[PDB]
Structures are given as C-alpha cells and as structure tokens.
Amino acid sequence: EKCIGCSKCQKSCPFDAITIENKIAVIGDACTNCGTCIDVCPTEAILQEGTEKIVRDLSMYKGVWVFAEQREGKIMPVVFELLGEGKKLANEIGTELCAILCGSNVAELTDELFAYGADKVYLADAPELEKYTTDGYSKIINEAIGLYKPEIVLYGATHIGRDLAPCLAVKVNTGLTADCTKLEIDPDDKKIRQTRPAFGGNLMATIVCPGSRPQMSTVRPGVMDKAAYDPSQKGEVIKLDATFNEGDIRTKVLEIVKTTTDNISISDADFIVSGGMGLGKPEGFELLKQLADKLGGTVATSRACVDAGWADHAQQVGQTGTTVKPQIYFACGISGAIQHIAGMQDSDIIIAINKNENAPIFEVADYGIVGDLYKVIPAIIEELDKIGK
C-alpha cells in the first residue's frame, strides 16, 4: 500500500515499463515474476507472487506483413522478392498479405505495391520520413503494433532493415532471426520455421519463436523471386497517425553519399574473374572486366600473363601468387597447373571456360564449358542482365 513512489524502480523491469497508464507502478500485462523488484523498493513493496509466468493467450491474431524499402520514394527490388515468397508465406497459413510503407509523399508506389501481389497496404506520408531514420520508423512502426497487431513481420536484409529489425524487436518483446534463407509454416501449430545460415555459413539452423507474437525476420536479398505484377487486385489503404514530438528522433542526417568503389583487392573480393594465356592479347581483360563489373569483383591473372607482360604481379594467384577464397571464380583460358589450382581450391564454386577439354582445370570445375572464351564470355553477360541480376 505505501508505495512511496520513489521512481528508482523503472528501468530494471525487462520490458522497460508498465508505467504511465496514468502512473508508475500501475503495472499489468508484462509482469514476468522476474525477481528484480524483490528488495529494490526501500520498504519491500509487492511481496507474493513470482512463480507464475504470463502464459495467457488470445495470442493469435493474423498478420503477414512485408516492409517496403522506399529509397528516395522508390520500391527497392528487394521488396518484390519479399512480396514474392512472402505472399506464399501468407497463403499457407491463411491470412492477408499486409504491407507497410513509410515515406514523405509516396503516392504511386501505393498502386505499385498493391499490384505486385499485396492484399492490404499501410502508408505514412509525412515529410518527416523523407530520409531514413531508426527512431522515426521505430516509433512509427511500434505505433502500428498496439493497434493492428500482426503475427508475422518480415524485413529486408538490406542495411536499412537490418537496423530497423533488432530495434523493433526489443520493444515488442518478440523473437527475431538474422538474414534468412527459406521459410515455411508448420501446418497444425501455427508458427513459422525460420531457417538461415550461421557460423560463417557452415551450420544451418531453423530457429523458431514459440512464445513470441509477432514473428519477425530479416530475409536475404535474392533468395525468393518476384510475384505476379499488375493484377491490380484491390487495395485497402489504411491510415496511421505520424504523431511526431518535440525531439522524439535523435538521429539527424547531414549528408548522404553515393560512391563508386572501383579499387578492390583480389583478396577482399567476393567474385573473381581470372584470365590466363588463353587471351592471346593483353586486351582480353576488358572482357573479363565487363564480366567482373556485373558481379562486383576484380580480375586476377596467372603467371603466364605476368611473365608475358599483360598484367602485374599484384593480380597473380597460386603458390607464388596470392590465395583467394571468393564466392565465385572464373577459370578462363588457364591450363590448370597445380601452381595455380593451389591458390583457389576452396573457392565456393569454380566455373571453367577452356577451349581444350583435356585441361586439368575441369577436375575442380563445378561447372564447365568447352570453347573459345571470346565467344562464351559475352554470351554469359547477355543472359545475365536479362533476369535482373
């Protein structure tokens, strides 16, 4: 009774509050019988409870929600994938596929995101959301939780979502997974089987959140694919408030920069196009330079070219050269001496392009193609952009 209202015991509670439904220690739906507030009150206030947890349900509402990255008010292609197999996600358990969008004066993307497959779409046209901010959408999406509480909340593994997601999870006291690979729904227990690679990609794990509503997960860009666009089904554009405060967003942006990173080390790269004496002329690297550019990696060389004068030693790979462990390697016109194969054996996948089929490189080639690279290489770039990288 004599709670003296000391206010010292506010933040040690694990959900930070329960305080101000007009008052501190006016608690309710989040006491987890933790035992932090046992003695921290000067006069031993509330003292008999604690072996009870919160498992009180009605915890099953719907909601399959896709966030829309809106770079400069434009849907980022990542959302077309997240709407691709996320609509699949919504269908198996049975629920609408809701979407949230937060921008400044976004008007046409409403119809775009409606057309690409989403049933329902939420919108926040407040010029205060012109740029990206972790508290703005934090508070703005946290606002959409108490009112339209969903069950599934998806995100993009892009640098925007991978910052929004953990911050949003801690306040709602739910569970989250990292950049995920593929998902499903266990048909009888309604929950989501989240799968992702961890341990640098050496141990896959299906992490699940049983006592957590909603279920959220940043999903990797490129794993799913696009859905059908422009059925122009409907829309139910719903409103949220965008009720900003007098300094309720401490992150403030000075400048945004867009660089063109052209310097990149053969050791740091994630994709490599290597060329050997199968070029004949030093000018071949332009071709491979074209190849490397659609992928975002560098050109490497073998000794034959260096000792011929077509390249510098910084580029060479093998026992005398430098060792590479990319995510992809292009073995173009290289005999295949162990003096080379030694320094790339652990490339996650090796693709070979040689004229003569009796070249050793096809021993570790994951995929092989026989021919002249000057014809094969350009055709590879053709079908490359034709799907959308």
Binding site: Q319, I338, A342
Partner: protein
Amino acid sequence: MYFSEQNKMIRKLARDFAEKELTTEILDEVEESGEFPQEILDKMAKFGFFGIKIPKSLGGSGGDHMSYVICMEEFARVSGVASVYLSSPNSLAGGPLLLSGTEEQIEKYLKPIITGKKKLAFALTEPGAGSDAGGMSTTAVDMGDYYLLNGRKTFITMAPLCDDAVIYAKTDMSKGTRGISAFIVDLKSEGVSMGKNEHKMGLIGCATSDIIMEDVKVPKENRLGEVNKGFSNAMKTLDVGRLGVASQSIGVAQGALDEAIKYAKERKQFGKRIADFQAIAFMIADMATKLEAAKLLVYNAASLMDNKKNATKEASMAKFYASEICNEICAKAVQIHGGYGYIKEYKVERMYRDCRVFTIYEGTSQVQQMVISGMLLKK
C-alpha cells in the same frame, strides 16, 4: 616445455605481427635492396619487441627468457633478417649494458636502443681472432683523461647503421684472456672508419662490415665495468646470444617444415599426391621429430636461465644441435619441393641460404663441441 599463460599471449602477438608485417612484397625488396625498412624497426620498438627481457625497472618490458626465445622463433620462422634486427638490442647490445654498466650509462645508452632511436653493434671478431677471441690484437691504452685504441674488427653486424659500438680491446697485452676490457665507442668519433659492406650468402637485409680504429680516443667514462673484466663480460653475454642463434635455428626450421608439408600435400605426380608416397611421409616424420626433440632442448635451456641456474652447457647444446639439424631440415625441404624449390620465388630457397651461418657464427659447432666436451671431461 610448459608455457606460462602470458607467454602464450606473447606467442600470439609475435605470430600475428611477424606474419602480418613481413609480407612477400617486402621481403623480396629486402633481398634486392639490402636495406631493412626503418619504418618496420620503429614499428617493432613501439610494441616492445626491442625490449623483451629487460625489465620495467629499467624501462623494458618485463618478460622472461622464454619470451625472448618465443619471439625469436616466431619471427625467424617468417624472415631470417628480421630475427637479426631483433636479437641485437635484446641480447647482444643490451647484454653487457645490463651486466657491467653503471646506472648513468644505462640511462644514456640502453633506453635509446629499446625505443629504436639508437643502434648498437657488438664488436669482438678480428681477422686474426675468430674462434680464438682471446688472441685479439686490438689494443687499448690508458692516457688518463681518455683511452686510446688501435685495431680492426671484421664481420661486425649492423655496424654501418649503428651509432655506438661495444668494442673489446686488449688493455694488458701480457694477460691475454685475463687482460681484456670493454668500451663503448661512438662510431662517429675520430679515427673510426668502416669497411665495405660484405656480400653474404643470405640474411641479406642487414649490413655487415669492418670497424677500423686508428688512434681513436675514447673517454674513460665510457668503459664497461671493471678493467680486464671484458672477456667474462663477453662470455656471459655470449651464452644468451647463443640461445638466440639456436632460437632462430628453430624458427626458420619450423617454418621450412610448414612449407614442406604444405607443398607435399598439394603436389601430385603419379595420380597420388606427393605426401602419400612412403619415402616422403617418413622423411617429413624424421624432420618433425628432430625439430621437436630439440625444440625441447632449447626451451629447456631458456627455462634454466630463467630460474638462475648456470645454463652454459645447456645453451651450448641448444645452439649446436638446433643449428645443425636446422640445416639438415632446410635441405630436405628443398628436396621435397623438387625442382621448384630451387627458384627464388619459392620461399624455401631463401631459408636454405639463410640457415647456413647458423652453424658458424656465434662460435662454430667446433667451438661448441669444445665447450661441451671440455665441460664433461675435467676429472
């Protein structure tokens, strides 16, 4: 032996460092241009590798001998010349200062070389005096306000890069081994002149020449300890130095072996890989067991030094056995590499050349055997 948990950390440090800062690109440039990059030396002193066994009482690092051997090994593995630039202030320059030096001399001389501002050469060998350092011919005369010296020193490591050099001259020409004093000489002084840099087989990056002394006057205030003690000074420095040379023997050894099993795993000839032919695998074994056997030899020597028992025999064994089986190892590693181990691009050839002095300098293997047998046969 058994490693103290701090020494395991130091092992980690010297590993990441020596591996990271001594790149192929650099080491190749050191062989071509016999000049080690001052920037790297500064970088080393900044984390104290120049001050391993000297205690914080004098502004050192407070490590034990095992930490000096650990750093010596892990550096020398990656590059020989690096080790040379490492042992000098730790053992050969900082030894006699640490023993027979007054507090003033240590304030003005030792701390500079621990921080990498000054460089100090240990100069004992003469053209007439090699193994028989007692048969010196450099003279030192007492004039009252200064000492006057007249002689010549061959094979003086780092000397053209050095600012002062501890030089051993004969004071009492009649006493011989009993009549040698040790002096600190500013190499910039009068009379002092340097010979040509010697073209050596390996360990290229560190210059090595003669120190010529022509009526050079040295003040009395720059003499090492007592008069006619110089010889015992140099011996008791030479024990920890020999521990150094065995230390680098074991370093480059473990390295050339690591390159050995690497090439033998990767190369294929008859469909099998090299390492699955019995001759090779057994050869690898043989090299490995000697190397370990004797790692245990030298580790043991250094631990004795750390617990203050005389290590004069144990160190001599360490230098002898370590350097010799190092050469055997280096060669065998060439032979595993086959033809390719004869081209300079394959690191094993630089090792093979480096590891050869190890049985000569710091006292030959013969001088080592003389010390050891002479210690076991006295009756």
